[PDB]
Amino acid sequence: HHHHHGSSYQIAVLAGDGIGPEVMAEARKVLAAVEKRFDLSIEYSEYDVGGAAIDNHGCPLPEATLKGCEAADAVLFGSVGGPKWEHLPPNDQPERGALLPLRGHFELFCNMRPAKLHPGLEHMSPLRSDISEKGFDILCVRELTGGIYFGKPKGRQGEGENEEAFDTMRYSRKEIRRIAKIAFESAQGRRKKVTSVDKANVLACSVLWREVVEEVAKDYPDVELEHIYIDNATMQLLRRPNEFDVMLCSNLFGDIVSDEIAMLTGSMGLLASISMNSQGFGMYEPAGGSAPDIAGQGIANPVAQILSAALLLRHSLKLEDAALAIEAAVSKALSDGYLTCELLPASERSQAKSTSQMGDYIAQAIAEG
Amino acid sequence: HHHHGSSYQIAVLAGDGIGPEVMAEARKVLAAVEKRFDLSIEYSEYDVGGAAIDNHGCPLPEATLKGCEAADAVLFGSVGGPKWEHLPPNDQPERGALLPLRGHFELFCNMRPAKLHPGLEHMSPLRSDISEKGFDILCVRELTGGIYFGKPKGRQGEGENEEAFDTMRYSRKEIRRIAKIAFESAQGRRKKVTSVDKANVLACSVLWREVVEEVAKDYPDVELEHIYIDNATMQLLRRPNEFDVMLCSNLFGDIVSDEIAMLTGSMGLLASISMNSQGFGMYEPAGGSAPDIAGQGIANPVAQILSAALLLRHSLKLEDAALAIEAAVSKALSDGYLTCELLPASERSQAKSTSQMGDYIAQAIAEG
Ligand SMILES: CC(C)[C@H](C(=O)O)[C@@H](O)C(=O)O
Ligand SMILES: CC(C)[C@H](C(=O)O)[C@@H](O)C(=O)O
Ligand SMILES: [Cl-]
Ligand SMILES: [Cl-]
Ligand SMILES: [Mg+2]
Ligand SMILES: [Mg+2]
């Protein structure tokens, strides 16, 4: 879809399952405030995805939803999955079923998961206090359309005790180069360090990864490159998270490293995910899941979904001041002690703010300019 | 080679860096144990790793491979160092010794026991309210299948379409043999197995989870749960006391064991068992060759010493001898015999040397 100057921007809204819809409502409330403020013309089109789409259409990614994403500038996505549908066959489940085909179809090779310890919440981290007091801010860049996720041969053959399954990890120089360039450009604008995570002592793919990373590293002389094996990286993120800036990982290794870093913040309800292609189209979603055990109770933390909209404004729509406004309003809520239940002790449950109290505060803070 | 009623044969492969100095403490402890229990053991020493490169021109000399073939078990140190890290990859110590050993000897079973020792919970990089509760997690890693040894591997093409590939493969036989060991291990511990996979993405993990469900029916007293690798990395942070045995494929077990080792904050205490179906195995510290402290007499020998205890239990079936070493090491750690790295720098004068630790532990076994 190409945007024309003065036309409305088009956002496909795919709220999904569980807490998706209730936090999406708060992202739409904060977006309405931003639209009025910075003067925007945005149109929204809602589509089912995930378990909601299994329930309404019989599959997790209906053709009408694919077509609706194709017509938009950007997708604001909630979360999918839940026990209702985990009995289902594999290709048929909400997450495998919606997320892998979305990524493949739109060539969303670039995943970026920003995580940091926010001022005054260092204590909720599961790290020892002398480590969490040091802070960290780590951007994970993960290659999303290659490696072992999409490689073939992939399947199962044979019989008796010798029946075997197989998966193939594959990477080309073109695929490694595009993802490495995003990690180095990111690092150039942050603290100028890329840690590339591989298993180059075992995997041919990682020997090639490390070679092509070294090639691209030549074009970014201001940025320090280091390499680390995936097993050692899980250890070093525990011991010295303040020493990393941008992580650059393959598809499986980035799946792992981004989750470990997310849990090290102790505040996953704050975390957002960007999945983009080379034309600037992307989907923007909370890193955490559909949390079906609390769906509908108004207790979910909507900051991850709100931040997802800020990153959509910045990355796809290039509406930079609109994005920073959201981010400032979120930070003002968190420092003015507007916290949801999972960011307070169990004894302070009655000071917790609801999903809608949080969105109200953040939307009001946007209007205050 | 099998054991007949005669002397046991151990092959000693000390390797590089701190390998020799902590092997010396392990040999001291073994001498005490052979005296107290009247054991009959013969030892043979072989170069491996960079020592082997420097002396023989390759990291796993044919003499070293044969010396292991002739033994009931191997006591292994560590290999690697910056002197050798510039060489072509197959010529380097680790890749060139460990992967050929594992493949040659069919060491499909890797076991890495990890726990917070009493009084050292504060070493963990976890928040105190988590670490103070303790944990003890045994990682069972499948060691000779999956993407480590799968074929094909290599490259195709040229320029932008130069591409590389690796293949993860697993048969039912390979999943069932390593699942059994996790279930037997759990039955002797806290009766829970957590199988770590990525069954929403990998065909090998769909077959892993099916074969693990089959094997679990034979151990109805053990709780089975499945967890995806990315989530397992987060749940081991928040609730490590809730896990007993982890059951993992080769790459997933390489990653999960390393995260758990760092959750202890005391990697100098940790040992690794690599065994085959015949009970032959190689027993070694989980930690590396630490060349920047080699020869200083600062290295912690507990992981090497505990490697010799596990060799006695798993390969030699000498349970009382194994338990003796474990009791002596626990005595040392609770009686203020701790090395450099287990104490604040401010308390360095209270730290024990490599040989002071061996002496004390050997002295303690010499006391019934
Ligand atoms: C649901 C699953 C296929 C997915 C992945 O592995 O990428 C998820 O873990 C994620 O990280 O977004
Ligand atoms: C050196 C490397 C090949 C090896 C492996 O990946 O298994 C190491 O990380 C280990 O855990 O023993
Ligand atoms: Cl991958
Ligand atoms: Cl594997
Ligand atoms: Mg994931
Ligand atoms: Mg490892």
Side-chain angles (χ1 to χ4, degrees), chain A residues 95 103 142 149 255, chain B residues 198 200-201 230:
Chain A
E95 287 168 291
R103 291 163 188 180
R142 169 187 178 191
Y149 275 53
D255 181 53
Chain B
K198 192 73 184 187
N200 49 5
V201 175
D230 59 334

Side-chain angles (χ1 to χ4, degrees), chain A residues 199 231-232, chain B residues 112 141 148 254-255 257-258:
Chain A
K199 189 81 178 179
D231 56 335
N232 191 41
Chain B
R112 283 164 63 173
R141 167 187 176 185
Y148 275 59
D254 179 54
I255 294 167
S257 65
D258 250 28

Side-chain angles (χ1 to χ4, degrees), chain B residues 84-351:
Chain B
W84 305 285
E85 65 187 24
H86 71 290
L87 258 18
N90 298 12
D91 303 354
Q92 292 193 39
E94 288 160 295
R95 222 187 110 66
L98 294 176
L99 305 169
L101 285 166
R102 286 167 190 175
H104 186 71
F105 290 107
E106 302 169 79
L107 304 179
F108 77 82
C109 177
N110 185 74
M111 293 188 281
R112 283 164 63 173
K115 64 177 195 192
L116 297 170
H117 275 81
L120 297 175
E121 293 90 335
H122 66 278
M123 303 289 303
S124 170
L126 293 176
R127 203 176 60 224
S128 67
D129 59 284
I130 298 167
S131 61
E132 69 197 15
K133 302 185 206 189
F135 69 76
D136 176 342
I137 299 174
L138 174 70
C139 191
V140 178
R141 167 187 176 185
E142 198 285 328
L143 201 67
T144 47
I147 201 168
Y148 275 59
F149 293 98
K151 304 294 180 195
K153 176 199 179 152
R155 297 187 184 190
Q156 66 194 193
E158 50 230 285
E160 294 302 293
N161 310 119
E162 190 174 17
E163 102 179 340
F165 44 89
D166 302 91
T167 305
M168 187 190 278
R169 208 170 288 279
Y170 268 114
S171 73
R172 287 175 177 282
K173 175 195 179 152
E174 292 176 295
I175 298 155
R176 168 164 270 108
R177 59 187 184 181
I178 187 73
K180 287 176 182 168
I181 295 178
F183 284 95
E184 287 180 330
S185 297
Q187 260 187 343
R189 289 165 57 90
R190 292 188 286 326
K191 293 191 214 294
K192 182 180 179 163
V193 174
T194 302
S195 184
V196 182
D197 72 32
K198 192 73 184 187
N200 49 5
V201 175
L202 307 173
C204 285
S205 285
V206 182
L207 178 65
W208 184 278
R209 187 169 294 210
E210 287 173 26
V211 174
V212 172
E213 285 278 347
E214 291 184 10
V215 168
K217 289 192 157 62
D218 294 356
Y219 299 89
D221 50 321
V222 174
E223 177 189 355
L224 170 62
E225 59 170 16
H226 306 287
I227 188 168
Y228 293 131
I229 181 65
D230 59 334
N231 191 39
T233 78
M234 302 202 295
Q235 297 309 141
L236 293 166
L237 308 174
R238 32 195 310 273
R239 58 192 184 85
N241 82 141
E242 294 185 21
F243 296 99
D244 179 18
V245 183
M246 317 300 293
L247 166 58
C248 305
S249 58
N250 205 332
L251 185 59
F252 298 148
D254 179 54
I255 294 167
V256 163
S257 65
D258 250 28
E259 188 183 3
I260 287 169
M262 179 63 69
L263 289 171
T264 74
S266 58
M267 304 190 289
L269 310 176
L270 299 174
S272 170
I273 295 162
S274 301
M275 69 203 278
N276 77 14
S277 62
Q278 310 305 131
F280 175 86
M282 61 183 289
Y283 299 88
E284 68 202 85
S289 62
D292 41 338
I293 60 162
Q296 294 181 42
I298 300 180
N300 190 338
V302 165
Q304 195 69 73
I305 283 160
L306 294 177
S307 295
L310 295 178
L311 182 156
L312 293 171
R313 165 182 300 122
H314 293 281
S315 285
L316 308 191
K317 322 294 192 263
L318 293 175
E319 178 54 30
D320 291 339
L323 230 44
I325 299 185
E326 291 169 339
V329 167
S330 284
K331 192 189 165 77
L333 298 172
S334 60
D335 192 25
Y337 275 75
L338 293 183
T339 41
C340 133
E341 86 289 4
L342 302 176
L343 290 167
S346 83
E347 289 287 296
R348 185 71 45 53
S349 70
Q350 309 327 110

Side-chain angles (χ1 to χ4, degrees), chain A residues 146-149 169 171 250-253:
Chain A
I148 205 164
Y149 275 53
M169 187 185 280
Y171 268 119
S250 69
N251 207 341
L252 186 62
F253 297 154

